[PDB]
Amino acid sequence: DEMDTHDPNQLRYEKFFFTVKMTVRSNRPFRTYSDVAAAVSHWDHMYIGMAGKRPFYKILAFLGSSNLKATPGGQPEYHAHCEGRAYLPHRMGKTPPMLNVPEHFRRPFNIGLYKGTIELTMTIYDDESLEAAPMIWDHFNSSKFSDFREKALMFGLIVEKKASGAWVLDSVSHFK
């Protein structure tokens, strides 16, 4: 015989560069973060974009909303810019190679007592550089407790953190 080595749960890693520009125009000021998450998570409805990149954007969208600062002018406006290089473990099989081609997303939302628009601009591409990079879970201030699993889920991210090592992106949900 020859070993059966096929594994759809193979824990592959990713190294990448990323950019996040996010603007959220809203009718009134957000009460909780939970509300922001809802509005921002609409970004992907009617998704036009790179199939193999969709999971990563969810992470950046999540990261976006984590940093959104209010523009004092505008009728409320929120803005965030996030940039860096990171290392991400996941269980999603062979990722196609990612090239620096910014992709554009702009859509509306109507939930609870809030209606408006989310504008998102995102880049993700391979980093062949052998130099060390921090886990993407480190660009989140709040990835230091289990509540984090809940928050990630609002963006369709299913994350694990076991007895050793960082959070691992186990899978991605698209609906709900």
Contact residues: another protein, CB under 8 A: 1-13, 89, 91, 162-166, 168
Q: Measured from the CB of residue 111, what is the shortest distance to another protein in angstroms? A: 34
In the complex, minimum distance from the CB of residue 35 to another protein, in angstroms, rounded to a whole number: 33
Minimum CB–partner distance for residue 8 and another protein (Å): 7
Q: Which is nearer to another protein, 55 or 89 (CB)?
A: 89
Name which of 48 and 132 has its Cβ closer to another protein: 132
Task: Identify which of residues 16 and 30 has a Cβ nearer to another protein in the complex.
Answer: 16
Q: In the complex with another protein, which residue's Cβ is closer, 7 or 131? A: 7
| Residue 143, token pair as written in the block | 């990835």
- Give the nearer residue to another protein in terms of CB position, either 134 or 165: 165
CB 50, min distance to another protein, A: 20
Distance in Å, CB of 166 to another protein, minimum: 7
Q: DSSP of the chain, one letter per residue?
A: -------TT--EEEEEEEEEEEEEEESS--SSHHHHHHHHGGGGTT--S-GGGHHHHHHHHHHHHHH-EEES----EEEEEEEEEEEEEE-S--PPP--S--EEEEEEEEETTEEEEEEEEEEEEE----S---BGGGS-TTTTSTHHHHHHHTTTEEEE--SSSS-EEEEE----
